[PDB]
Nucleic acid binder design. Structure first.
Lengths: 178, 182, 187, 186, 188, 187, 188
RNA sequence: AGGCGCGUAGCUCAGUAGGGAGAGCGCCGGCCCGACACGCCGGAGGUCGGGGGUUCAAGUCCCCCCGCGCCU
């Protein structure tokens, strides 16, 4: 199986505990005859995030999204655009509440982190956040492989697009059982 | 095959370019030997944001209110990637704007101005230059499926239609365009 | 253009109040304005039989069968998107659960209640509201939907479930209340 | 050999008898890993299968042999007569259910008993509205995933069987699936 | 605009009764109202030949050939759904079994009966009812069905088999008792 | 290679006599020949149901499903020539008239003669030979025809009516007495 | 609106031109008046027209026959016929050829014993011609009539049993040649 | 998700090579008795739940569908 693993399954506390952890993963991921194939943009974003790397690049092939030959359903974009309005409005309401709180009391160093967390939770959790996730979705919908990841939005979009999903907390056990 | 939108009739500028603008548009389209297709969502939004009266029963005989049939359409993945990148950039910009507004609100005693400024910044950073309403996506899909001209006024809709591959038009000359083809 | 008619176009009180003022005269004015306007009007045979079994206009059915082309949707050469069936079943399961729950509440209320005909009427009305409003309730609505789909015509209906599920397919929809005015202008 | 699976394969008592649910999962996996077949259960069916029963740590090994994915309904189509027949029979049942509710309420009027009669009404309503026809969207997912893959539908749900037959889906006897996997492995 | 005519339009005791009195003259007024409506009236050649074999009016055929376009369906360029033939065969099996049952009961009744000629007549009537009423029986029916299907025309017949299978196949049906009034309103 | 199987392949004495003996080893050896053939055998669901009604082995049906694929012919996407229906209806009319003649002859011979018990059996034989021998006589046969037509597969059946009406469609036919030897070398 | 594709048998076969004014020549002139007034569109293929001018002959009447009846080839390069049509044609031709051979054998054997070949030659000619060329397409003229009626979707007017029979198998509108006079008369 | 059992007179139930539509209990006409009671007889007492097949013959055997329940 061509497992299309994203960065959420490679660099994350839950991902690392379930599967530093790169060596313990590659102990059996390169085995079991499963040709993992990660996106190239996902690899670049992971490298920008955090990081033997040349050996980890010798198992999962960093391929291109190949969006030229790929097409997306119209409903798959309508459902994204419908949730985008709700997420943006929730973020705007959170910002308005933060401004109202700052009007009365003044704590910049405590309000800035809270506002950043609220924005990142209400506008980047539960939906496709970046282009590095759309690339993974397109690669999975093109290679017809597994879509091991941990993002709720990525999983709920891959399920709505027809991609196959395998439990991230079970990816290590699945790879070790094949 | 002109895929109309709400901007072509809700905007006072486009209406004045032509209850009178609707009648003139109906009379022009009913004799221009042309097809007009307005999505059901966009038409519902326009009818809930307009009260033209006595012309909704004549625009139905000129325009064709129908859904873009998203079940059969297939948007290119390149447009999705471009929209995702633009949305991520706009989300980062909106978060930065919200942080700046929160920082600036410390020294201000009138929330009625800071909140309004934040709302204006958000409605132009996260809802301009990209598709924002489901009606816009419906218009784009209806134009792409029927291979028509996405007559509208929003810049984000025009940019998305150009990226997808749908031929665009100019609302300024839209009345002139329908006048020549009549 | 092609107008796919329905039973609600001739049976709904408001629809035959915009169509003249009497239900019999409504269909006669429909014949008057549909023999004109140079348009094509279609109704499924099942819908036609149900509508003819609801009301009886007599000798006007002869003039009615002319302009309205009564025929089956030709479902063998027709197809429906799978997402449509998915969404219909998803809504239907919820409405079935709602109907079962309201039946339970009505039974528990009638346990101690004295008057029973009133509660039986309440159960009937609430059940037909919770299970036959908002979706495709009969295969007559399905026939109207499919005839509109294959003809690329405008589904003329006052039923809200029919209009909703025609929109979710991609069928052109008209506003039933003013349909006489889309008809009067065409002539 | 592509085998689209349902909840009923591991939810029905007789089907895992012809295989304990925990042991049945393991024997099915044993026979499915080396069957050289392609087992495809839908994602919504998988979610409801997780919700009805929980098996300890066997989901991890379940997930790779039994591929889990959505039917991809945007590229699939269903015959018009299929929906026509479904909604005709659906109307029929809905009516039957209304009559059952009327019967139970009118006989509950002079009975004073509700604790057993509510259960009887539940059973009659479920029998008259959800047995022999497609009820959940999970059934539709199994149907369409077998239709797209030209799949063998393995299910103990008689409604799923009789409505997959109307589509053209290769149907199988769920009581023979284990001894089918036997011969397939051999 | 396109009406496909069966034999019942001019031979059934009721349809010609609506048009006029008696089989003759009814077809005459039908012609009067048919060359006046601009519609395209059609009937298959087999149906025409068998109808002429049933009713043998004289010179009326001369002006009848002008209006009704006698024409066999182009069955080579026509197709019928698989489910249509499936349903036809499935129902016909039941009808054949019913006819066999009727035959057995009539044989057993005649085993102890004296007026065997009238028993034979009743067996004839019951067999004809059980095997040919409510279903397409002759190739005339199939020819009418295909002629209406290919032309996208309006089938006019008082045969319940014709109507109930034209409905299954997708042909615009019409009430044969109102078709004279339809001709009048098409003229006017 | 695709073979669309009938009921006669494993129920009619001649074919299952070529396919070994006892009719229970027949299916066993058939499946055998089918396993190492890569020949994609098929059977319609209705024919399989009638098979299970007529014959019942037990645990051989366990391995019957692995080689033979049972599914409906997908009649919604299939079409049949109009001339086929025309010919079928005309021949069926002839056979119905012959059956009525047989009935009205046996009634007359019951009028005068005796022993109606064997007379009924003779009437049954003559009627079922006049109406069902040499023509399509069940929807199972129609399903076999349609599944062979859609798949462009080989129709294996000793029914003379099935072969005769499959030839008129364009279905690759085969001698049912040679299917075993066909299967032997196809390995 | 209505187009008739004429044949040679229309004005050559005794009965058909006897429906018009008598004699093969006056019937032509009366048909000319009736067809000119009808405002229809009559046609006949070129080969059939040549066989007309050869088998029959009039002077200064074809100068008027050229106008109403439009003589042209059926334009056969843009036309097709069903495969089953040719299949049935050659199937029937095989039987006719075998029967003609048997007739020839029987007449040779009759001439063997009876030395009266003078009338036997005529009898054999009549039987052979009836055996292979009666009631079937037997000349490219008939094929041209068929194809000109098929391309125009017109009314085939002919007294030939074979031409009508084989036009019925392809979907050509047919008429009774013995009232075709009155098809035109009431049409005017 | 399915499984089993039973629908037979007014009630409760037997019946099977597939060769009868019954028993007990009811109701009436008889009958000892003034007459009802008891006994003693008989008559009335059928969609064998429905449809489809097979048979010479079906409540019986096969298929499907309803109802009643028990169901785990």
């Amino acid at each position: 199986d061509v497992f299309v693993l994203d960065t959420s399954v490679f660099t994350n506390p839950e991902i690392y505990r379930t599967f530093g952890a790169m060596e313990t993963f590659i102990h059996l991921a390169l085995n079991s005859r499963a040709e993992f194939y990660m996106p190239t943009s996902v690899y670049t974003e992971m490298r920008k995030i955090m990081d033997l790397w040349a050996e980890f690049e010798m198992v999962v092939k960093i391929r291109s999204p190949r969006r030229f030959q790929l097409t997306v359903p119209a409903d798959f974009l309508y459902e994204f655009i419908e949730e985008l309005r709700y997420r943006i409005n929730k973020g705007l309401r959170i910002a308005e509440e933060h401004t109202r709180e700052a009007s009365g009391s003044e704590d910049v160093g405590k309000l800035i982190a809270r506002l950043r967390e609220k924005y990142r939770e209400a506008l980047r959790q539960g939906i496709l956040d970046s282009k590095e996730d759309v690339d993974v979705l397109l690669l999975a919908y093109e290679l017809d492989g597994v879509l091991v990841s941990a993002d709720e939005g990525l999983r709920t979009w891959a399920d709505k697009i027809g991609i196959k999903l395998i439990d991230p907390k079970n990816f290590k056990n699945i790879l070790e059982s094949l």
